[PDB]
Amino acid sequence: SAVKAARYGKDNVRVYKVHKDEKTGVQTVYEMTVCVLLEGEIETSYTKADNSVIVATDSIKNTIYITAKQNPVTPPELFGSILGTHFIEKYNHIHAAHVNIVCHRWTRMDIDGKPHPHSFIRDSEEKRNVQVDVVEGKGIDIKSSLSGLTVLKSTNSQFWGFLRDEYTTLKETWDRILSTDVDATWQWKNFSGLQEVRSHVPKFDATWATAREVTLKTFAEDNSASVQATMYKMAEQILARQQLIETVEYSLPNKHYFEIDLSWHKGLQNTGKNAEVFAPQSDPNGLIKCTVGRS
Amino acid sequence: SAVKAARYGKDNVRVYKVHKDEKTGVQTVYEMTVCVLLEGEIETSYTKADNSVIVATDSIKNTIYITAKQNPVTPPELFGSILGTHFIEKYNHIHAAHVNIVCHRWTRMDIDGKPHPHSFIRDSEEKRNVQVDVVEGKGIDIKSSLSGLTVLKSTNSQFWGFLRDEYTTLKETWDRILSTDVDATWQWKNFSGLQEVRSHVPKFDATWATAREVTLKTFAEDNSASVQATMYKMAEQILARQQLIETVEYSLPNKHYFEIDLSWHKGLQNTGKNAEVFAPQSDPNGLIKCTVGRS
Amino acid sequence: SAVKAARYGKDNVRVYKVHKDEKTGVQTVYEMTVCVLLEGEIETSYTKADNSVIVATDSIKNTIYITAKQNPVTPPELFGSILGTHFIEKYNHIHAAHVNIVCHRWTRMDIDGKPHPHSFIRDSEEKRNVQVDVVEGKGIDIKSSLSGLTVLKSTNSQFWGFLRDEYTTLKETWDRILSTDVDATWQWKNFSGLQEVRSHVPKFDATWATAREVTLKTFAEDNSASVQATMYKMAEQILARQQLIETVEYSLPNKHYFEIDLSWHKGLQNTGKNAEVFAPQSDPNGLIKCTVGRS
Amino acid sequence: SAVKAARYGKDNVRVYKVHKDEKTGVQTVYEMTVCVLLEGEIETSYTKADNSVIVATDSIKNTIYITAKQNPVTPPELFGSILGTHFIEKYNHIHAAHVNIVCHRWTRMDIDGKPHPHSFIRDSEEKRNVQVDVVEGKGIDIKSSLSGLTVLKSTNSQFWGFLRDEYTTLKETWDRILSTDVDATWQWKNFSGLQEVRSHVPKFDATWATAREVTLKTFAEDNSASVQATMYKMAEQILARQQLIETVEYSLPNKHYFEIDLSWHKGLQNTGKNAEVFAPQSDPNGLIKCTVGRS
Numbered sequence A, B, C, D: 001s002a003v004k005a006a007r008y009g010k011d012n013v014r015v016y017k018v019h020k021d022e023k024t025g026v027q028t029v030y031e032m033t034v035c036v037l038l039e040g041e042i043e044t045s046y047t048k049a050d051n052s053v054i055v056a057t058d059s060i061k062n063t064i065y066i067t068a069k070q071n072p073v074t075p076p077e078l079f080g081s082i083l084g085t086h087f088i089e090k091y092n093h094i095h096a097a098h099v100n101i102v103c104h105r106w107t108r109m110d111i112d113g114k115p116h117p118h119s120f121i122r123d124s125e126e127k128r129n130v131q132v133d134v135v136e137g138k139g140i141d142i143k144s145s146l147s148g149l150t151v152l153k154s155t156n157s158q159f160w161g162f163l164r165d166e167y168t169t170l171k172e173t174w175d176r177i178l179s180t181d182v183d184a185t186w187q188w189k190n191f192s193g194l195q196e197v198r199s200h201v202p203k204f205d206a207t208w209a210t211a212r213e214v215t216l217k218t219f220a221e222d223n224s225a226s227v228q229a230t231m232y233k234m235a236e237q238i239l240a241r242q243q244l245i246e247t248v249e250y251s252l253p254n255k256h257y258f259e260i261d262l263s264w265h266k267g268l269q270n271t272g273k274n275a276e277v278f279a280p281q282s283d284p285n286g287l288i289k290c291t292v293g294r295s
């Protein structure tokens, strides 16, 4: 037998960094969870018990903290690029570094209407993420995403005109609840290396902001014909607003809310126009996905 | 043998309710998870296979939705009281109803700076909860709480002067991170029944708001001597601001963030005054609890 | 205000211990998660920032590992007793120690039909637990339990003869699925202190074994009239087999499996006697509880 | 813009099936969670609100239950193939079906040493899974796996001889704990369609059994030089025992157990040869992956 593919490293590395402004007293915190997996001339660790080719995953962990100490950890696209570039440059025989970063929210508290200098709240489990693949000889591929953005609209969602055959029981509807957990990913043009990534640093926060804003506004304003149609509009707009993005991907569950017929109880009317109480369904759920690119 | 205690019912009942203002088009949503457990003359269901004394848990589920259809679901203290009162009044032989409600956040979205009439965001996994125990002959006991409120302050937390003996390795500190998940509970004076609960309806949202506000402000402003001392201040203030509360309980984990000594690497300084990168510890964690009452 | 109740300490302390038999080469592992919360003359830590009365939770963590190093960690009832007794004896001003222990399964692997000397498998997420409350002047109260024991029987479960009124839609059934996650707790006679606990050491593993055996056999053999009736039988038997137990508590969810009517599709028959495919319901679920004592 | 990729359907479809032997009274249960995502000429649902091309995900759910009613649900490789083949054959314009199945354990209980005819225990959260991609014109690609198989060996694991530089703090060790959650995947030769899958039905349970057996035996018997080296041996053997498998993939976390130096306390010796009490680390963890193919 032979090794067709291999990568190894340290996952679930929790990192916090604080920035203190000496002059203002304002402190800023960042918290993330980091995974770094390396590829290279490491097949003999698997086939021959040759650990000489292994950069220990414990050392990869140390390196993550040292890199956070010596560089900015924001935007996560830049940090991941610095981190991955380090491994392929430091170790001749390592030829790719795969860096995934989950950024956790720490939003400054407002106390009595004034931003507090050093207290924060996790104002959502929504995440901002990056996947940075640093490949020697082939630059840096970055996928940026937002995930865990949980939303609901109580009307202005429809689903009718779908295929109807002997497997179909679903009633057409012109007014339903739509609720989802948004997973949205924008894939950047390949970057030739760390300098090119750095040359675009401002665009990373800007594009994340645009993607979120477009997601929320389209979700709220689209009188939705379906999840499919709504998510395409989101993707289309994001592409139109950042030329350095090549594709936009959405992965959306349809978290169903079912009407409850109560007419069996004293003729209570709770369906159609009289629907007020619904049963949220934990499972199953629709799952709808789209990758949109430039025509 | 004999039954010393018994209660039974339906847990994890997910409920959504929408309120539509016909005139404005503004819709408002509520989502909760409900548990109702009943007590009464039901020992024979356990000892004699006598199911005649059982109100089926499926029927308790139906009753939850019907009650939500026919009454306000807010404040959760009132809904739980209505619900529990129904079971003990409807069924002679049922003498207590234990209603736990978890309220989930659905905060109206602001789109282009204007509140949207029917789109919402889950802007936190923080919960507002109630535990309502309706006991025939003995009124209604309500415990209200907030939970899952996750906060961090990056300085103005201290821990020194603790007991030091042969089991102690912890260094005293005058400047550390403090991060916790706030679980705060306020226990109301017994209410004689549903009318008395209704007579106090406005106080339920007001007291929840006060508890949150006092929690966040004390957390942010107290140069903390310890979790113990900070949480007591929170509780003291809440008691001072609502005379219908008898006790205030806090349950707080201390979610440790550890310094990382990196001086082994090129003499890097990352401790004490130079501490910038920390390792959040998932476990273990301190757990600190207090119940505060009136002197 | 004033402190009405207080306890504090370290939660989620993961502990592993290995026992190596030098002579046989057979190794045995134990893994648990420990929480120790202390009570005593500690009110001033909360009201006066007096940390002198605080045994740091970090030191409580150290003490957990030291105690595991110097004593047996099995049965967990004994370990918890040793641990809690240490705190109230070591610290004059500490008057109670509350020790919760979750034991994780590490079952020796059989390889080619022979037990392996040092490899183990987690052959279930089922837990064996103890709650040991050590109260100065008042001995040691122990609650032992098994939890997370997930079972299903595909027939020989019934539910009929329950109360029927205007809230009832549930059909009576003479043949249904019953599936639950067993949480079973046996509460021991108070022990006067550590010597008395030690005098009963063998009974702890024996009683845990009996409780599990009786649970599984009753579940499998009882043509169940209801969860209520079945769980009472379990409790009755356990009480009859260990006189040092005062009560037996069960907490059982009824994890419903619903029939699926498919006759709308080509007259397919999948209900009643023809029921083969069912939909497991994640929520809601019945929750049925009983505490049984001696008449 | 334009749709570069799209797939949609129903996730988290829980399914139970019972088989009753009329003659013996022996019943057998299967429980799984199913996801079916379809691809085809569906771009206009996204770009033009054309729902005519959508097979509703609700109908895909119905179809899952109907297929389970009318066919065997075991081995999961065959069920997934039947299910995916149905969609591409039934709907001209659907050209791929992606079926993921998670099988949940329901192992027959032994009561008083005899297998019970209709009671089962979930004797592990370990899963048996399939990923079946049915592509019109291109047959059926199946990946089979086991996951969630959690194991520990308390000695006969080593890690030394790794790369040492300025980022390295890890001590070499000749005797450590190794614990992991096994994720192992075997990828089958492409099948031309449903007949070819059926022609190999017996091999699916046999190969799953071999993979598990080889995993457990190698884990227990290999005096491991590293995770890398041990997992390669597992993969090598599995490939040697089933020629219809093209590759074998492992994904293994190294769930670290750290020594605890206690010599600061009364010179207690708990390291090296005296190590008995360890601290399991929840995070971070190494993550080691390998795909092995035929040379």
Ligand SMILES: O=c1[nH]c(=O)c2nn[nH]c2[nH]1
Pocket: A159, A170, A225, A226, A227, A228, A254, A286, D008, D054, D055, D056, D057, D058, D059
């Ligand atoms: O938006 C929707 N898209 C779908 O494909 C679908 N199928 N059922 N309900 C649905 N709703």
Ligand SMILES: O=c1[nH]c(=O)c2nn[nH]c2[nH]1
Pocket: B159, B170, B225, B226, B227, B228, B254, B286, C008, C054, C055, C056, C057, C058, C059
């Ligand atoms: O605030 C704190 N309280 C405690 O009791 C403690 N113990 N260790 N660290 C601590 N911090």
Ligand SMILES: O=c1[nH]c(=O)c2nn[nH]c2[nH]1
Pocket: B008, B054, B055, B056, B057, B058, B059, C159, C170, C225, C226, C227, C228, C254, C286
């Ligand atoms: O065993 C049961 N007990 C109950 O109380 C019940 N209620 N609905 N179904 C039930 N099944």
Ligand SMILES: O=c1[nH]c(=O)c2nn[nH]c2[nH]1
Pocket: A008, A054, A055, A056, A057, A058, A059, D159, D170, D225, D226, D227, D228, D254, D286
């Ligand atoms: O088996 C191991 N492999 C690795 O690559 C490694 N790195 N640190 N510890 C390790 N153990």
Ligand SMILES: [Cl-]
Pocket: A254, A285, A286, A287, D009, D057, D058
């Ligand atoms: Cl859907």
Ligand SMILES: [Cl-]
Pocket: B254, B285, B286, B287, C009, C057, C058
């Ligand atoms: Cl603490």
Ligand SMILES: [Cl-]
Pocket: B009, B057, B058, C254, C285, C286, C287
């Ligand atoms: Cl029930």
Ligand SMILES: [Cl-]
Pocket: A009, A057, A058, D254, D285, D286, D287
């Ligand atoms: Cl590792």
Ligand code: NA
Pocket: A087, A088, A089, A090, A091, A092, A093, A094, A095, A136
């Ligand atoms: Na390199």
Ligand code: NA
Pocket: B087, B088, B089, B090, B091, B092, B093, B094, B095, B136
């Ligand atoms: Na009553």
Ligand code: NA
Pocket: C087, C088, C089, C090, C091, C092, C093, C094, C095, C136
């Ligand atoms: Na004492």
Ligand code: NA
Pocket: D087, D088, D089, D090, D091, D092, D093, D094, D095, D136
């Ligand atoms: Na087709």
